[PDB]
Design a protein around this ligand. Structure first.
Ligand SMILES: CNC(=O)[C@H](CC[S@@](C)=O)NC(C)=O
Ligand SMILES: CNC(=O)[C@H](CC[S@@](C)=O)NC(C)=O
Length: 145
């Protein structure tokens, strides 16, 4: 409920950020750095800068995309069913900017809830633990492992 026009996004995002978040174009498995990033911090929507994921919940599923057991809060994302490409899938988008993020699957680690949020790295901006104050995310420094 807080998204710019596509033309504004076209001039402010990279081609990969644009195609993934605005056209739901899945990045190639293993292609984004965030697939192999495991440092403390938060992952935010590239469009709104709203907090989406904590480093605490990030894990390697071996899929080739950033994987998380949960969003930072259920409120941060919007999920819906998708029956395209002949599949039953649940798409995940950010709440405020409504960016396409990826999909959620019921094959995540059971000790952490059983869900795998499979997210394009291109849909995210990583904010390191240390920069979280300077960038306005002080109050979430404690969701971070
Ligand atoms: C290759 N990755 C896995 O098998 C991951 C690792 C889980 S975490 C909690 O370290 N497990 C699953 C179910 O994807
Ligand atoms: C079973 N895997 C898929 O359907 C994945 C979705 C990954 S998340 C990042 O949307 N898509 C492809 C094209 O392999």
């Amino acid at each position: 409920y807080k998204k710019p026009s596509d033309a504004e996004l076209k001039r402010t995002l990279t081609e990969e950020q644009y195609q993934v978040t605005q056209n739901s174009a899945t990045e190639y498995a293993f292609s984004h750095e965030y697939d192999h990033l495991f440092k403390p911090g938060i992952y935010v929507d590239v469009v709104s800068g709203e907090p989406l994921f904590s480093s605490a919940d990030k894990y390697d599923s071996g899929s080739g995309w950033p994987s998380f057991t949960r969003p930072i809060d259920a409120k941060s994302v919007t999920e819906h069913d998708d029956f395209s490409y002949n599949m039953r899938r649940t798409e995940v988008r950010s709440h405020a900017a409504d960016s396409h993020l990826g999909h959620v699957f019921p094959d995540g680690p059971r000790d952490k809830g059983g869900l795998r949020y499979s997210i394009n790295g291109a849909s995210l901006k990583f904010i390191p633990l240390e920069q979280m104050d300077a960038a306005g995310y002080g109050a979430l420094k404690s969701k971070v492992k």
